[PDB]
Design a protein around this ligand. Structure first.
Ligand SMILES: [Cl-]
Ligand SMILES: [Cl-]
Ligand SMILES: [Cl-]
Ligand SMILES: [Cl-]
Ligand SMILES: [Cl-]
Ligand SMILES: [Cl-]
Ligand SMILES: [Cl-]
Ligand SMILES: [Cl-]
Ligand SMILES: [Cl-]
Ligand SMILES: [Cl-]
Ligand SMILES: [Cl-]
Ligand SMILES: [Cl-]
Ligand SMILES: [Cl-]
Ligand SMILES: [Cl-]
Ligand SMILES: [Cl-]
Ligand SMILES: [Cl-]
Ligand SMILES: [Cl-]
Ligand code: NA
Ligand code: NA
Ligand code: NA
Ligand code: NA
Ligand code: NA
Ligand code: NA
Ligand code: NA
Ligand code: NA
Ligand code: NA
Ligand code: NA
Ligand code: NA
Lengths: 305, 306
């Protein structure tokens, strides 16, 4: 009965020649474990929303990906995290941007959705709201990793299978559940050497995250400014819904044509209401995985064959 | 098509019985002067971008509308302001949210567009970036007004003025314009919502939700209950319905404002100009503070029903 999940962990240029297989396998194992968790939840009748929330939570926890633990550093050597989640069944959405004292932004985004009349909260206000609902306050030092610090130092001067450049790491999940509900979630640490207070596409409904039962669930990763300006995630939905494009056609138009034409780089993952799955990326590679409920998953980092 | 400007200063329920004519005239005159200024600029060959920036700046300055001076108060008796500007010719955009120490958020938004490689900046980071560009730091007390303070007090009291009742959320300001060179632009600014949870963001600073412009389709600025405008991507949905669905501006506005948004429990309106110079000011509320005019013609102003 067509339940399916896809996940991503960022996009970038291929650096396989500098990697050992054992290094690559750490990424593959991470992606495999999370997608398999998602598939299991789906086959057991869990909701798309719960599935994308848990998958993004696990991706935040994984230090290899730019969200939560493993977040990139800002120019001030701090971390500012953003996340979004959307329920295609109700069209409700929750989002946080600019948070430093919450371990799992996607769970905070979810709290904004389910435990407030709002869609988006920012900064200390967002944190205070979450703390008032019992979410633990953490120090942002928990997110810090030497790989991302190395990259900050290289960035301000004049280690992974993919080179994200400064902006193209982020994480996300999309799912269609056994009830026909679509959901999407996205989380990020932003961009290496970011001007504090800058916001990219990840937490913005219709830019980095979108879900609607009648069309598509989408999560993006890439150079944020272009994905905002082109409403990348909603554009997929609109092309299909109004233009009558297939998911594949819509993905080609956005990722391979429109975004590049505006100078945007990255990719996205998408599931449509008929259970078609697509993981387009205009970069050389993208950390990714997907699988139908009850089938064996597929993972990838580099080019498709 | 022909150069044209529209503006809004928020939406709401009609509260005429409590007004005198002379009070209403002050609102009509406020709207009229701003739209006239825009028309003049358009006639003089000024850019859509410059026009919508200036109109929204004037609307922020005007204490009657919820943006800049006259901003609503948060739960904590503070002001947190948000703004967006979008250039339809380049598809660049600039936005600030959660700013308290900048007199004119739309000018800060324009600064994000033009003097940073970014599209959106929030809070103190946004403020610091503006200051670094020589923008003046102000104290938020400058925004405070007696009308809005009383609205906060009423919100705080347990149970159930101006020509329109914005309720808590439906006040914002905005402008859309088509210039003599065929460019579309949009800008939106807000003080947010009365008794707001600090850190909450509505549709106004969000590209595609409260503000959108693309020379190939439409310029749009919204005002209403923000959450629904975000979830439905009101501004870009107009563009997408026209561009991909083939709907006229009239059809797209009807679909979004009168059908889709209400179906999600949303209330408010928007202003829109398409690339062919058609202008629409739809609102599913009883009224909307609004005005528009073609360059070289007399403007039209409205508060209550069409
Ligand atoms: Cl690449
Ligand atoms: Cl290589
Ligand atoms: Cl090996
Ligand atoms: Cl909502
Ligand atoms: Cl917790
Ligand atoms: Cl980004
Ligand atoms: Cl297109
Ligand atoms: Cl485009
Ligand atoms: Cl691979
Ligand atoms: Cl009345
Ligand atoms: Cl009277
Ligand atoms: Cl840009
Ligand atoms: Cl200044
Ligand atoms: Cl709002
Ligand atoms: Cl529709
Ligand atoms: Cl009303
Ligand atoms: Cl009347
Ligand atoms: Na992580
Ligand atoms: Na909510
Ligand atoms: Na729909
Ligand atoms: Na990114
Ligand atoms: Na590619
Ligand atoms: Na004002
Ligand atoms: Na910019
Ligand atoms: Na009350
Ligand atoms: Na509003
Ligand atoms: Na286009
Ligand atoms: Na109406």
């Amino acid at each position: 009965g067509k339940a399916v999940i896809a996940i991503h962990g960022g996009a970038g240029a291929i650096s396989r020649a500098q990697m050992s297989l054992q290094q690559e396998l750490r990424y593959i194992e991470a992606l495999s474990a999370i997608v398999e968790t998602g598939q299991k939840m789906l086959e057991a009748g869990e909701s798309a929303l719960d599935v994308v929330t848990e998958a993004v939570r696990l991706l935040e926890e994984c230090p290899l990906f730019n969200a939560g633990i493993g977040a990139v550093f800002t120019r001030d050597e701090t971390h500012e995290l953003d996340a979004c989640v959307m329920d295609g069944n109700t069209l409700k959405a929750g989002a946080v941007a600019g948070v430093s004292h919450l371990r799992n932004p996607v769970l905070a985004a979810r709290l904004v959705m389910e435990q407030s009349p709002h869609v988006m909260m920012i900064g200390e206000g967002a944190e205070n709201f979450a703390f008032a609902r019992g979410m633990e306050r953490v120090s942002p030092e928990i997110f810090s990793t030497s790989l991302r610090y190395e990259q900050l130092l290289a960035a301000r001067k004049e280690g992974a299978p993919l080179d994200e450049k400064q902006k193209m790491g982020a994480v996300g999940a999309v799912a269609l559940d056994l009830d026909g509900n679509l959901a999407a979630a996205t989380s990020t640490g932003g961009m290496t050497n970011k001007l504090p207070g800058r916001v990219g596409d990840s937490p913005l409904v219709g830019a980095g995250c979108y879900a609607n039962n009648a069309s598509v669930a989408v999560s993006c990763t890439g150079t944020g400014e272009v994905f905002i300006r082109a409403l990348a995630a909603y554009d997929i939905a609109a092309l299909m819904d109004y233009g009558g494009l297939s998911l594949a056609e819509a993905c080609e138009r956005v990722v391979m044509e429109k975004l590049p034409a505006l100078g945007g780089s990255g990719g996205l993952i998408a599931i449509d209401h008929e259970g078609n799955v697509a993981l387009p990326f205009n970069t050389e590679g993208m950390y990714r995985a997907w699988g139908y409920a009850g089938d064996t998953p597929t993972t990838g980092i580099y080019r498709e064959k």
